[PDB]
Structure 1
């Protein structure tokens, strides 16, 4: 909540589902990209944002995986 998660019980349950289990990658859908910043406030410096549409994506992820960087990928529709 301190990051800026919404008060709604629905949005609490959702955030819980994202975090609590990560034996698998979570897919976040939100029209208002309010959520992209919530996860950013949580991981701080470590937060590196990418998008399937940028050209350097292919290499930037290889750099992200090698040095423990927490990654959010901005365009999930295109994969």
Structure 2
């Protein structure tokens, strides 16, 4: 259901709270050549926007227009300090490993990846 919520988010961006770094690996395995990682960087994000490449950023403020779909149609995206043309297939992902600002939290589709006593109870019942 974590991956279902991830794939069923076409409006709000999903969150990858994965200190185990498994979600990023399975996402990159599914995607392939359309995966680019970050952590200059504004220029490479604008280049990825213009090319039409899915971007994943680690360690989650100037991506407000892209995260809010504040696009200008004449379809151009005003990102950073210069407008970037939209290919239409651009997608963005957010990854973090620390189990967060309120504005980001109320906007990103947050999910939890934590095993606890409830998890071990579910595991022993399943086995």
TM-score w.r.t. the length of structure 1 is: 0.70
Point out where structure 1 has 5 or more consecutive residues left out of the alignment.
Answer: 1-12
* Structure 1 segment 38-77 matched on structure 2, within 5 A: 38-51=26-39, 56-76=40-60
2:6 aligned with 1:15: no
Q: Partners in 2 of 1:38 and 1:62 — Cα distance?
A: 25
TM-score w.r.t. the length of structure 2 is: 0.45
Return structure 1 stretches of 4+ with deviation > 4 angstroms. Answer: none
Alignment length, in residue pairs?
Answer: 63
Q: Partners in 1 of 2:20 and 2:36 — Cα distance?
A: 19
Structure ranking higher in strand proportion: 2
Alignment RMSD: 1.9
Structure ranking higher in helix proportion: 1
Larger relative contact order (CA 8 Å, sep ≥ 6): 2
Q: Decide which structure has the larger Cα Rg and report it.
A: 2
Corresponding position of 1:33: 21
Point out where structure 2 has 5 or more consecutive residues left out of the alignment.
Answer: 61-99, 105-127
